């Protein structure tokens, strides 16, 4: 034992995935008005598995498009972006406390 992997856990890979998800969600919000653009989804479980050791998912629209072809539901995108930011803040707190505890033990302070 006594290794950074065994000490940090999955809180280092989770942060990267949460930032990846925010990039995907922000892309859907920006591309909301572009006709023909299809909303992009991200699988957290698969992304976390790939990050730990190392495809395109589309979001099914709740209602038909008005003709443009864009399936971005901006009501859902804001809700997911808000959730992603909260869980990302927790992951930073979880990962940040891993380093603080490691520093505390190696210095006894």
């Amino acid at each position: 034992a006594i290794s950074f992997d065994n000490a940090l856990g999955i809180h280092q890979h989770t942060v990267g995935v949460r930032e990846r998800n925010a990039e995907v969600i922000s892309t859907n919000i920006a591309q909301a008005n572009t006709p023909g653009y299809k909303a992009r989804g991200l699988d957290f479980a698969k992304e976390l598995q790939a990050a730990t050791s190392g495809d395109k998912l589309y979001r099914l629209p709740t209602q038909p498009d008005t003709g443009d072809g864009n399936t971005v539901d901006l009501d859902l995108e804001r809700n997911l972006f808000m959730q992603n930011q909260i869980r990302h803040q927790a992951s930073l707190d979880f990962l940040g406390s891993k380093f603080k505890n490691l520093t505390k033990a190696i210095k006894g302070e």
Binding site: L74, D75, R78, N79, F81, M82, Q85
Partner: protein, 48 residues
Amino acid sequence: TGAIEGSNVNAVGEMTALIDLQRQFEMQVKMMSTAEEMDKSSDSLLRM
């Protein structure tokens, strides 16, 4: 022969169509206004 045929426009029929087109037009305009009103409200979600 000796006569000219006029138009068959029913003036009342057009006028009653006009007043119904106005009201239906105005009701949809209110739908546009309440659509952006909902959109403005659902913007504090990302306002941390």
